[PDB]
C-alpha cells in the first residue's frame, strides 16, 4: 500500500467453497473463516457442524454448534446455495468454450547465433485444458520442448507458449498441433525451413 | 472434482476496506462495488444470464467487520505478517510493431490486500485505458491481482509496472520492452 503507514493490519477472510463432482450429482460445501491468513474455524458439509482449525477458532465452533437453527441452514446449503448457483451460472462458465488463436514465430536461445527456437503461441482460449505438440516432417519431436506453462490472463482466457529448440534444415516442415475442447479436430500451424 | 465456485469476502482494518466476489475455477464471476452498491460482472455478457442483489453484499461485509473486531481483540491485537508480492509483466498476445496489444501486470502471492500500482511508460505514469481487477483469492489465502494497459508496440517505448506493498522495502518495478 501507500500512505507511508507502519500501522499494524488485521484481516478477516471468509470463503464459501462449493465443490461439484459430475455436475450437481455430488456436492460439498466448505466454509473457511480466516484470521490474518490462518484458517481458524471451518464448516464442512461432510461433517455438518463447525470444527476449530486453530485454538483461536474454538469459541466460534462451540458457540455456532450450540445454535442448531444455524447448523440446519448450513446443512441445507449444498442444495439451497451450491446447487442453486450451479444452475444459475453453468451455461456461461461450465459450458464456456473459446477457441485459441495459434501463431508460430522463430526465436533464438543465443542472441548472436541463428534462429534455433520455434515458438508456438496459443492464446485467448477457455477452458485451460490444452495439448500442444511439435512435429518435424510429420513426426512428433518431444525432445527440446519448453513452455511457459498455462498462463491465466485474468479475463476468462488463458495463453501459453510452447517452444521447440531445433536447427532448421532446408526442406523441413515444422508444425505446431493444438488440441482443445473448443475444436473437434486439432488446430495446426506450419513453419517452413 | 470438476468445478469449484467460491464466494470470497474480506474485511481489513484499519483501512476499513471490504470486498465481496464470486470465483469459478480461478476466474472472477463478479464482484460488488461497495461504494456504488453495484454488481460488477467480470464480462458484461454475464449480466445477460444472471443477476445478483448487491445490497446483500453490504450486509455481509458489516458482519465481517464486526467479527474481525472480535477476532482482533481475541488475538490480543496480533497483526498480520506482510507477505510481499511477486510481479510478472506480460502481454495478451505476441508483440507486433504498431499492432494493438495489452500489457498485463500480474501481482501474486501477497497479503494484506492493499497495493499501489502505477504503469510507467519511459519512466512516466500512464493512466489512459488502464483497468484492473479486485483482489482475487488463492488457496493459501494470499491474494492475486491483474492490471491491464492497452498499448501500441514500439521500439522506442519502455514500460514498468510499479508495485508498492508494505511487505516490500522499496517499490518493485517490473520492466518490459519490445525485444
Amino acid at each position: 500500500g501507500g500512505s507511508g503507514d507502519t500501522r499494524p493490519r488485521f484481516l478477516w477472510q471468509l470463503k464459501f467453497e462449493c465443490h461439484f463432482f459430475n455436475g450437481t450429482e455430488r456436492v460439498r460445501l466448505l466454509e473457511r473463516c480466516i484470521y490474518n491468513q490462518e484458517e481458524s474455524v471451518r464448516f464442512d458439509s461432510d461433517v455438518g457442524e463447525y470444527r476449530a482449525v486453530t485454538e483461536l477458532g474454538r469459541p466460534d465452533a462451540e458457540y455456532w454448534n450450540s445454535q442448531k437453527d444455524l447448523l440446519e441452514q448450513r446443512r441445507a446449503a449444498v442444495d439451497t446455495y451450491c446447487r442453486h448457483n450451479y444452475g444459475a451460472v453453468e451455461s456461461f462458465t461450465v459450458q464456456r468454450r473459446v477457441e485459441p488463436k495459434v501463431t508460430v514465430y522463430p526465436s533464438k536461445t543465443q542472441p548472436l547465433q541463428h534462429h534455433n527456437l520455434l515458438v508456438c503461441s496459443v492464446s485467448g482460449f477457455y477452458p485451460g485444458s490444452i495439448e500442444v505438440r511439435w512435429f518435424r516432417n510429420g513426426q512428433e519431436e518431444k525432445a527440446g520442448v519448453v513452455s511457459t506453462g498455462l498462463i491465466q490472463n485474468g479475463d476468462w482466457t488463458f495463453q501459453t507458449l510452447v517452444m521447440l529448440e531445433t536447427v532448421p534444415r532446408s526442406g523441413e516442415v515444422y508444425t505446431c498441433q493444438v488440441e482443445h475442447p473448443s475444436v473437434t479436430s486439432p488446430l495446426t500451424v506450419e513453419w517452413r525451413a | 472434482e470438476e468445478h469449484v465456485i467460491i464466494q470470497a469476502e474480506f474485511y481489513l482494518n484499519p483501512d476499513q476496506s471490504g470486498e465481496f466476489m464470486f470465483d469459478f475455477d480461478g476466474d472472477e464471476i463478479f464482484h460488488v462495488d461497495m461504494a456504488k452498491k453495484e454488481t460488477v460482472w467480470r464480462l458484461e455478457e454475464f449480466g445477460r444470464f444472471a443477476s445478483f442483489e448487491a445490497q446483500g453484499a453490504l450486509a455481509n461485509i458489516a458482519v465481517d467487520k464486526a467479527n474481525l473486531e472480535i477476532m482482533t481483540k481475541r488475538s490480543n491485537y496480533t497483526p498480520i505478517t506482510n507477505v510481499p508480492p511477486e510481479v510478472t509483466v506480460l502481454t495478451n498476445s505476441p508483440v507486433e510493431l504498431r499492432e494493438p496489444n495489452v500489457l498485463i501486470c500480474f501481482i501474486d502471492k501477497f497479503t494484506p490486500p492493499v497495493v499501489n500500482v502505477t504503469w510507467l511508460r519511459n519512466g512516466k505514469p500512464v493512466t489512459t485505458g488502464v483497468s484492473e481487477t479486485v483482489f482475487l483469492p488463492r488457496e493459501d489465502h494470499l491474494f492475486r491481482k491483474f492490471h491491464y494497459l492497452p498499448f501500441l508496440p514500439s521500439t522506442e517505448d519502455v514500460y514498468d509496472c510499479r508495485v508498492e506493498h508494505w511487505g516490500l522495502d522499496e517499490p518493485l518495478l517490473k520492466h518490459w520492452e519490445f525485444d
Binding site: 469459541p59 444459475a88 | 443477476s51
Partner: peptide, 15 residues
Amino acid sequence: PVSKMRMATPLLMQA
C-alpha cells in the same frame, strides 16, 4: 429469464 444467484451469510460471533 435471468437466473438469480444467492449468497451465503456469515454467522455473527459472540461479542
